[PDB]
């Protein structure tokens, strides 16, 4: 049973035994092959009776390529390679014979010979259609030169004589699957094969039409260049009219397949275009009867006129009518727009023919599209607006730019889908179609079109994008649609959040997605920035409710602002834009955050325009933003912080804070003081930043900021004069004080020029500041300042809170004590006591004179210390003896007014001078020596020393005073004034005689007001006359006569006194 021989005819029985029942993946295949050939090589009847069996066996034992079987098939195909020459020399003549015996005789087609022909053809196709053999043949030009002939014999066998249905089927399956021709056939050897397609045998078998259509569909994908070069023959022949005749005659699969041929043909024509316009000249230009053969013209449905006039009707006419029939009659929309699409692409993918879309007779196409779009099915609308992708491709990629008006009309036609979907905007499908078509337009016009430039980008943006957005996008209501389209805009200008090349891909079922858009590119942005922003801004103004899009659009818009365009205009434009964003919104925490980021990035973008001292644009802007915000102060502060963070290592924060202090917001001031007064101040600071910081401390000085600032000044690397930047004379008194203390203690511990100049002008005019710095300066000496202050403004001494008398004695006034003498009224007790000591010890006697009333007013009301008054008064009396003048003597009068002065008064009564005695006035001397005892009565010495041998009228004045005052106690002593009265004639005259007369009479008148003295009367009476020698002069006798007569008005001793009286009278008798 075993050992079935592989060769020698014992294997091949009649019509059976093919294998391989179980000889898989083994060289048994090889044996079956070689033995087979070893049978085909003989010519005996026994071996020729097994041809059909050998070729059926071959066609059976060849495996099919599976994804799990490739090494086995390759080994078997190598097995076929080894025997290639035997297969040539043997099998080619078998094909020749098997063909001639079938085509030579027009009738009597033999069945078995047909079997053999089919089997042989299938073997040869199996050896030509696949395998590495085509590669192996590049090493053997002879074998390919021998193989080429099969194409010739098939070429003749397709047009010659009764080729049976199965014969033609095998031939077209071979010519459909054959692959050797890829490498070894020239154009001139292929074109005849293509010419055969048009003219073959009669058919009407719905299997051969489909097989031929598959043949065409493979030939397009195999030799595209030649299939386009020869389209004029094969397309109007066995492909195109199949659609015009319709589904009545041919099954649906026929029509659909031929339409697919149109699609593939498009896929190929989009790579070469062809400059001969063969498709257009063939379909739209030439008549019907010119390009459709009679075979199909005799089966062509037509009306009366278009049938009687086959010269004015075109292929495109019938095709358009038939598409309309598929929409209206069949409702097979998909078929209709598949056609329509392939038609439009094949006809108008040439730049010359694109413009023909604007012609009137070519807008019937678009009307047809409308006929397909008004259907109720959502997917039908969506598809009818999706197929415009071909229009997008043709217009965008095949425009010439030259005819600007033609371009603008073509773009207006490209905006048609939006016109269609406008009234359907409430339907999701229409919206998805809008997004689809727009993305196709942007992709095919910008992202993929690598030839956009100055002359082009304007035509695209100003006549396609801008019209789309101004006419349609900004007017759609659903904020999700606006969200998507505006998102497209955001993705164009960089700043992408798209989650992530050839224009071709626009013509796809899924189309373009958002992830295939960015960028624009930048080099176009810098040029046409204004053009772009003229649309972006509108988008922002219409999408104020969609805060995210406004935030991202404004931010990534500023991020792409060129440096060469950072001027005032753009700044103000962004200002108006943001202001519109806030005006049409309400303050929510979210909008607070976003708006904060927008303002911060806006100020940071134009930073070098807000940081100039005289612009004030930052102030205006702050006023604008304060409208829509709760905590506006914290919006200013948060703005400062954010702008600082944006330029962390780009612009020093000091320069920002300086110009943010022109806003006078208290919270930014607090932040500035807290920042300067605690941050680390680097010694490596540049002068620009240092002067900025100095302006900060100058604007808002604080204790900590002064400390830290000066600690920086100690470590600088450049000279600097602080007072050209600080202007410390303007600060509050406290900050001034602390600046002085810190600057002194730290910088020098000593006063320099600038400090002197500052103090000599800021202190004399401020009593509070003076009282504040007084302890510090007092401790640090620096008397050249304090003495200057008192010299230029004495009233500072009144404003000293705790004015120590030691400090006052050391702070002599001192050059203009006249003011102090005049204004001593406005001072304190002990301070006056110690003050007058400067006038005394300074010999400022005149100042004590002209302002004596205030001095007596001071000493009047007592004081803290009375010993002070004691010494002061002692020196004052020394001055009273030195120079009488007048004031100090009124002061002596006031001393007499006070009783406690008794000690100093007696002192004065014991210290007299022969010059002062008559500068003394009587009106006070009387009241002085009357109401006092002997202590004051010791002044009487000089008094007597002037009574005798002195001045007449002063003595007479004293006597008149004591007379009119009636001071009886003093009159006891009269001997000396009586000696005067006796020796006072000299010149006499009635004036002095009457004077002495009256003065004597009245002086003796009140000598005793009550006669109760008893023996004293005797005592005095014995002495007052014991010193009376009236002998000299006669006018004395009158005086003595008055005396005696007055005595005669008043016991036993009075008689003796009378006798002595008569004695003096006798002495008078001796003078008469």
Curated annotation (Swiss-Prot):
Instruction: Show the GO MF annotations.
Output: centromeric DNA binding; DNA replication origin binding; RNA polymerase II core promoter sequence-specific DNA binding; telomeric DNA binding
Could you tell me the keywords of this UniProt record?
A: Cell cycle, Chromosome, Nucleus, Phosphoprotein, Telomere
Q: Where are its TM segments located?
A: none
Q: Which residues form a coiled coil?
A: none
Please list the GO biological process terms of this entry: DNA double-strand break processing; DNA replication initiation; negative regulation of DNA-templated DNA replication initiation; negative regulation of mitotic DNA replication initiation from late origin; protein localization to chromosome, telomeric region; regulation of DNA stability; silent mating-type cassette heterochromatin formation; telomere capping
Q: Which domain of life is it from?
A: Eukaryota
Where located? Nucleus; Chromosome, Telomere
A GO CC term assigned to this protein in UniProt? chromosome, telomeric repeat region
Biological function: Negatively regulates telomere length by preventing telomere elongation or promoting degradation of the telomere ends. Recruited to telomeres by interaction with the C-terminus of RAP1, which binds directly to telomeric repeat DNA. This may create a negative feedback loop in which the addition of new telomere repeats creates binding sites for inhibitors of telomere length extension. May also influence the balance of transcriptional silencing at telomeres and the silent mating type locus HMR, which is mediated by SIR (Silent Information Regulator) proteins including SIR3 and SIR4.
Oligomer and partners: Interacts with RAP1 (via C-terminus). Interacts with RIF2.
> Which protein family is it in?
Belongs to the RIF1 family.
Protein's recorded name: Telomere length regulator protein RIF1
Specify the species: Saccharomyces cerevisiae (strain ATCC 204508 / S288c)
């Amino acid at each position: 049973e075993t050992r079935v021989n592989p060769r020698a005819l014992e294997y091949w029985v009649s019509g059976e035994i093919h294998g391989l029942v179980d000889n898989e993946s083994v060289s048994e295949f090889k044996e079956i092959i070689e033995g087979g050939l070893g049978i085909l090589r003989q010519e005996s009847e026994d071996y020729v009776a097994r041809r059909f069996e050998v070729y059926a066996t071959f066609n059976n034992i060849i495996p099919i390529l599976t994804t799990k079987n490739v090494n086995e098939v390759d080994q078997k195909f190598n097995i076929l390679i080894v025997n290639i020459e035997s297969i040539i020399e043997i099998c080619i003549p078998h094909l020749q014979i098997a063909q001639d015996t079938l085509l030579s005789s027009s009738e009597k087609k033999n069945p078995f010979v047909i079997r053999l022909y089919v089997q042989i053809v299938r073997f040869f196709s199996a050896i030509m259609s696949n395998f590495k053999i085509v590669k192996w043949l590049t090493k053997r030009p002879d074998l390919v030169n021998k193989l080429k002939v099969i194409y010739r014999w098939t070429t003749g066998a397709l047009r010659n004589e009764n080729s049976n249905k199965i014969i033609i089927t095998a031939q077209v399956s071979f010519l459909r699957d054959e692959k050797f021709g890829t490498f070894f056939l020239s154009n001139e050897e292929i074109k005849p094969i293509i010419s055969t397609f048009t003219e073959i045998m009669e058919i009407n078998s719905h299997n051969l039409i489909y097989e031929k259509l598959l043949l065409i569909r493979g030939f397009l994908s195999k030799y595209p260049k030649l299939m386009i070069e020869t389209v004029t023959s094969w397309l109007p022949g066995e492909v195109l009219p199949r659609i015009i005749i319709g589904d009545e005659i041919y099954s649906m699969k026929i029509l659909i397949t031929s339409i697919v041929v149109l699609l593939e043909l498009l896929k190929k024509c989009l790579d070469f275009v062809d400059e001969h316009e063969r498709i257009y000249q063939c379909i739209m230009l030439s008549p019907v009867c010119e390009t459709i053969p009679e075979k199909f013209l005799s089966k062509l449905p037509l009306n009366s006129y278009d049938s009687a006039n086959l010269d004015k009707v075109t292929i495109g006419h019938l095709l358009t009518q038939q598409i309309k029939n598929y929409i209206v009659v069949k409702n097979d929309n998909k078929i209709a727009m598949d056609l329509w699409l392939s038609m439009t692409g094949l006809l108008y993918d040439s730049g010359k023919r694109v413009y023909d879309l604007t012609s009137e007779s070519n807008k019937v196409w678009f009307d047809l599209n409308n006929l397909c779009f008004i259907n109720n099915h959502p997917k039908t609308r969506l598809m009818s607006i999706k197929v415009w992708r071909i229009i997008t491709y043709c217009i965008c990629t095949k425009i010439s730019q030259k005819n600007q008006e033609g371009n603008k009309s073509l773009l207006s036609l490209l905006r048609t889908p939006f016109q269609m979907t406008l009234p359907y905007v409430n339907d999701p499908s229409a919206r998805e179609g809008i997004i689809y078509h727009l993305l196709g337009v942007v992709y095919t016009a910008f992202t993929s079109n690598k030839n956009l430039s100055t002359d082009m980008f304007e035509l695209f943006w100003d006549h396609l994008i801008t019209p789309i957005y101004e006419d349609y996008v900004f007017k759609y209501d659903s904020i999700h649609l606006q969200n998507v389209l505006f998102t497209v805009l955001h993705l164009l200008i960089g700043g992408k959040n798209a989650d992530v090349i050839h224009p071709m891909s626009v013509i796809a079922s899924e189309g373009v997605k958002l992830k295939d858009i960015s960028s624009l590119p930048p080099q176009i942005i810098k040029r046409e920035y204004d053009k772009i922003m003229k649309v972006v801004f509108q988008a922002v103004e219409v999408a104020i409710s969609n805060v995210n899009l406004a935030h991202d659009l404004i931010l990534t818009s500023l991020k792409h602002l060129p440096e060469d365009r950072k001027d005032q205009t753009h700044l103000e434009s962004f200002s108006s834009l943001i202001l519109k964003v806030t005006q049409n919104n309400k303050d929510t925490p979210i909008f607070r955050d976003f708006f904060g980021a927008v303002t911060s990035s806006f100020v940071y973008t134009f930073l070098d325009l807000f940081l100039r001292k005289n612009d004030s644009s930052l102030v205006n802007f702050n006023i604008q933003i304060s409208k829509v915000g709760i905590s506006q102060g914290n919006m200013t502060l948060d703005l400062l912080k954010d702008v600082i963070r944006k330029a962390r290592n780009e612009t020093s924060e000091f320069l920002i804070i300086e110009k943010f202090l022109e806003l006078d917001d208290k919270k930014t001031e607090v932040y500035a003081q807290n920042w300067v007064g605690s941050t680390l101040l680097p010694p490596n600071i540049s002068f620009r930043e240092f002067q900025s910081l100095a302006n900060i401390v100058n604007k808002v000085p604080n204790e900590n900021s002064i400390e830290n600032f000066l600690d920086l000044c100690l470590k600088l690397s450049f000279p600097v004069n602080l007072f050209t930047l600080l202007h410390v004379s303007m600060w509050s008194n406290n900050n001034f004080i602390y600046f002085i203390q810190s600057y002194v203690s730290k910088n020098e511990n000593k006063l320099n020029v600038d400090l002197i100049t500052l103090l000599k002008t800021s202190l004399p005019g401020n009593p509070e500041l003076f009282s504040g710095l007084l302890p510090f300066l007092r401790r640090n000496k620096f008397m050249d300042i304090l003495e200057y202050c008192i010299h230029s403004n004495p009233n500072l001494l009144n404003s000293i809170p705790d004015l120590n008398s030691d400090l006052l004695l050391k702070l002599l006034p001192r050059s203009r004590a006249s003011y102090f003498a005049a204004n001593i009224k406005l001072f304190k007790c002990s301070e006056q006591l110690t003050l007058v000591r400067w006038l005394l010890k300074g010999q400022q006697l005149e100042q004590l004179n002209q302002n004596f009333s205030e001095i007596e007013n001071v000493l009047q009301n007592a004081s803290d210390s009375e010993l002070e008054k004691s010494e002061i008064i002692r020196e004052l009396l020394h001055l009273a003896m030195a120079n009488p003048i007048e004031p100090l003597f009124s002061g002596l009068l006031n001393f007499c007014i006070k009783n406690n002065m008794a000690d100093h008064l007696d002192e004065f009564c014991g210290n007299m001078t022969s010059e002062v005695l008559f500068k003394i006035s009587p009106e006070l001397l009387l009241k002085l020596l009357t109401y006092k005892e002997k202590p004051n009565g010791k002044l009487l010495a000089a008094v007597i020393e002037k009574i005798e041998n002195g001045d007449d009228d002063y003595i007479l004045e004293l006597l008149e005073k004591i007379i009119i005052q009636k001071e009886i106690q003093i009159l006891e002593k009269l001997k000396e004034p009586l000696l005067v009265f006796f020796l006072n004639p000299v010149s006499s005259n009635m004036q002095k005689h009457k004077k002495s007369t009256n003065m004597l009479r009245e002086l003796v008148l009140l000598y005793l007001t009550k006669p109760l003295s008893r023996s004293a009367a005797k005592k005095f009476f014995s002495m007052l006359i014991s010193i009376l020698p009236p002998n000299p002069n006669y006018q004395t006798i009158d005086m003595v006569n008055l005396l005696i007569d007055l005595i005669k008005s008043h016991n036993a001793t009075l008689k003796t006194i009378g006798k002595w009286i008569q004695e003096s009278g006798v002495v008078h008798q001796g003078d008469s």
